[PDB]
Symmetry: none
Amino acid sequence: AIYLQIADRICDDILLGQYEEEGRIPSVREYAVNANTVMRSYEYLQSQEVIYNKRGIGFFVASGAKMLIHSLRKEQFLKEEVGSFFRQLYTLGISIKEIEKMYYEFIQRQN
Amino acid sequence: IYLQIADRICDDILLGQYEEEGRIPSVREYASIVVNANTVMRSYEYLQSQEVIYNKRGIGFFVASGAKMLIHSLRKEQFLKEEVGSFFRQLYTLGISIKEIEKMYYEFIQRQN
């Protein structure tokens, strides 16, 4: 959903040190091909402590929102997918000794 | 669809319509000229995680340097899994020699020529 299809399109350019932690970020009017729902985007991200507000000044990345943001998407994976995914190895007759085989060998690919 | 697009664009690409290290226009724009927009998201993922393309962050997508050729191949190797099997079976069933069908791939080539 785009309330959150955008709230996730921001926390990343922070993990990339493009937006410095406790360094600033963009006027919405300017992040305007849409700036309407954005108010519900920035919403998500404020109520998620990812960013903060100076009265009349503008907008920064909350420090260690690098680390504030890493943390959020973790429990929205072990809640989200794992629980079915656990329940699939189950139904399928696959084991963790066979899955931590293909995983430890799965790094070979990315190096 | 998820896919069809790849071809209109790839053929844009093999037509050199889009240069390698050169830009394809917005996922906003292209869907007008053709008329849906968000299923045009389900494509550039497939493409840029298939390496025929990439998105400079905050600029757009580009042709990947060496694009015109992986395609031909992935066009070539896709002939090799579900398009070719469809065939050897028959040249087997109906009683067709290999050098049988081969005869008429060389008259084929001659008309091109």
